[PDB]
């Protein structure tokens, strides 16, 4: 007699899948829907170079911290890299008001050229600009300060009413930062700014606030008993920004021509940066997969898979592998 058995194939494969009826069953072939592998490098997202602040945070890069000179900003970036040990940010004590959403807006910028709305050489004739360097912001030993801001002093024995406006003429949202100094003592207040009471009004077509010092002795942070409170706004492509102050103003030396592109986030990791081509990027490591699910990290930026808690997500494309 002859034989025409109908059967399925088996192999030496030991891949295991789980069904509702039976778990830990071997299959001949399977595909992993759970990408558990990452290159471990913060590589390029979309097609442009992600920003790396190194030993800096957003409050230090944008302010112009002396420890942020190593980084380069030239073109669009898809996300911002910070080391978890990055503490070289705001080197003067204080709270950066509206901080986290400024971090969110500045996460991805299509057109960022760091230009100079007010040149230090000529834009402030009647005020002293060289004295605004602090021992709380060292660059190399000696006292330094933010490059992107000038912290003004009365020149001689008077602080005249500063009034200087920037008519935006670049077609992009000019991002502006300024500071308001809060001295520890009223003697410090007068000896820095001749006026005892000092309003700082900053106006725009859409944003208007008045700022006043809060003069009292704080506990020492970074060997400083006073705080230095920072503000920012987005100047629209055709409107104005009026800067008015009779004291306690840290003018923008450098503003930042900005054009937001769809928004992104900030990745905080120790991971080194290399040049790759990755659709998804996690702090642990960049992934290029079309696979629907991941388990590397919840915080992900890009066209990323969904983060799950599973460990065995395999579709059992092959049959039940029952060898012999």
């Amino acid at each position: 007699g002859d034989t025409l058995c109908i059967g399925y194939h088996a192999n030496n494969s030991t891949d295991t899948v789980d069904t509702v009826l039976e778990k830990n069953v071997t299959v001949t072939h399977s595909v992993n829907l759970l990408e558990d592998k990452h290159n471990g490098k913060l590589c390029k997202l979309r097609g442009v170079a992600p920003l790396h602040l190194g030993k800096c945070n957003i409050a230090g890069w944008i302010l112009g911290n002396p420890e942020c000179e190593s980084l380069s900003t030239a073109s669009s970036w898809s996300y911002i890299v910070e080391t978890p040990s990055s503490d070289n940010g705001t080197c003067y004590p204080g709270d950066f008001i509206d901080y986290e959403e400024l971090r969110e807006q500045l996460s991805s910028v299509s057109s960022f050229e760091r230009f100079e709305i007010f040149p230090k050489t000529s834009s402030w004739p009647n005020h002293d600009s060289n004295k605004g360097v602090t021992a709380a912001c060292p660059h190399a030993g000696a006292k330094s300060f933010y490059k992107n801001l000038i912290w003004l002093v009365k020149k001689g024995n008077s602080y005249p009413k500063l009034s200087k406006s920037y008519i935006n003429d670049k077609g992009k949202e000019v991002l502006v930062l300024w500071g308001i100094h809060h001295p520890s003592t009223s003697a410090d207040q007068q000896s820095l700014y001749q006026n005892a009471d000092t309003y700082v009004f900053v106006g725009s077509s859409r944003y208007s606030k008045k700022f006043k010092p809060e003069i009292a002795i704080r506990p020492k942070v970074r060997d400083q008993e006073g705080r230095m409170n920072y503000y920012w706004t987005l100047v629209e492509p055709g409107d104005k920004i009026t800067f008015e102050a009779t004291g306690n103003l840290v003018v923008p030396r450098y503003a930042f021509a900005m054009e937001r592109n769809a928004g992104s986030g900030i990745i905080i990791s120790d991971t080194p940066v290399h040049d790759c081509n990755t659709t998804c990027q996690t702090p642990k490591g960049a992934i290029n997969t079309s696979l629907p699910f991941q388990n590397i990290h919840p915080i992900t930026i890009g066209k990323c898979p969904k983060y799950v808690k599973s460990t065995k997500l395999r579709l059992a494309t092959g049959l039940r592998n029952i060898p012999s």
Partner: antibody, heavy 126, light 108 residues
Framework: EVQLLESGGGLVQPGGSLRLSCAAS????????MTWVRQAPGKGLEWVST????????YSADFVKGRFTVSRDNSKNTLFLQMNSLRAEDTALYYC???????????????????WGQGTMVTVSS | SYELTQPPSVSVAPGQTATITCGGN??????VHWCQQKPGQAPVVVVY???DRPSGIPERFSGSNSWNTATLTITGVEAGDEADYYC???????????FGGGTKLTFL
């Protein structure tokens, strides 16, 4: 112009007292922190005590051991200093200096002594 | 606590760069107010900060604070540069003013 002035004492035995003053004129006196610095005749400068412009928080050196206390009078535009002479090593020319406005850190106190007063001899010895 | 040490004297040839040093602890994070004293005179400030010069004082007087030492780097010594050069700093930690012994430099 800013003209800091001096007044001191000639000679007092260890166990006596004498009065120093710095009658500043020519500027807004309330808002600059006055000092006192001395030097031995042929030795480097050494600081005695600063004062705050408000007349409150006072700072002084380590050689005083609590004896020397600078006091500030804003109303008459004149600074006062306590020489309660108890030791014979305090022979010097006594200068009062004005702290110019500082640069960010320690503005009222950590500033250059642009206007240096002259020196009144104060010698203590048996 | 905070200590300032300077050379007792610094030798220099006429017209050659004269360097005056006020060493100590990390004086970089600290404002140095250089001031010279001629015999029978009061301290006239020549560099009232890290690096900036007052008016009425010739340009050659310069200063550059560094990691541990301040340097009143005079670019060219002449007959009017023989004096004792003190360094004055306000110590933030202990709230003091500390001078130094100074350099009695001679242009020879």
């Amino acid at each position: 112009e800013v003209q800091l002035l001096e007044s001191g004492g000639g000679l007092v035995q260890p166990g006596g007292s004498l009065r120093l003053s710095c009658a500043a004129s020519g500027f807004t006196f309330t808002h600059f922190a006055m000092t006192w610095v001395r030097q031995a005749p042929g030795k480097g400068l050494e600081w005695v005590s600063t004062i705050d412009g408000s007349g409150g928080g006072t700072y002084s050196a380590d050689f005083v051991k609590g004896r020397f206390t600078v006091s500030r009078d804003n109303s008459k535009n004149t600074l006062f200093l306590q020489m309660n002479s108890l030791r014979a090593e305090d022979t010097a020319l006594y200068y009062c200096a004005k702290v110019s406005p500082g640069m960010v850190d320690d503005p009222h106190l950590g500033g250059a002594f642009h206007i240096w007063g002259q020196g009144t001899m104060v010698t203590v010895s048996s | 606590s905070y200590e300032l040490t300077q050379p007792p004297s610094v030798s220099v040839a006429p017209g050659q760069t004269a360097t005056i040093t006020c060493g100590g602890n990390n004086i970089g994070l600290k404002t140095v107010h250089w001031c010279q004293q001629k015999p029978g005179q009061a301290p006239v400030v020549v560099v009232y900060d890290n690096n900036d010069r007052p008016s009425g004082i010739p340009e050659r007087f310069s200063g550059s604070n560094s990691w541990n030492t301040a340097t009143l780097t005079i670019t060219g010594v002449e007959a009017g540069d023989e004096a004792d050069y003190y360094c004055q700093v306000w110590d933030s930690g202990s709230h003091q003013v500390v001078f130094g012994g100074g350099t009695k430099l001679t242009f020879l």
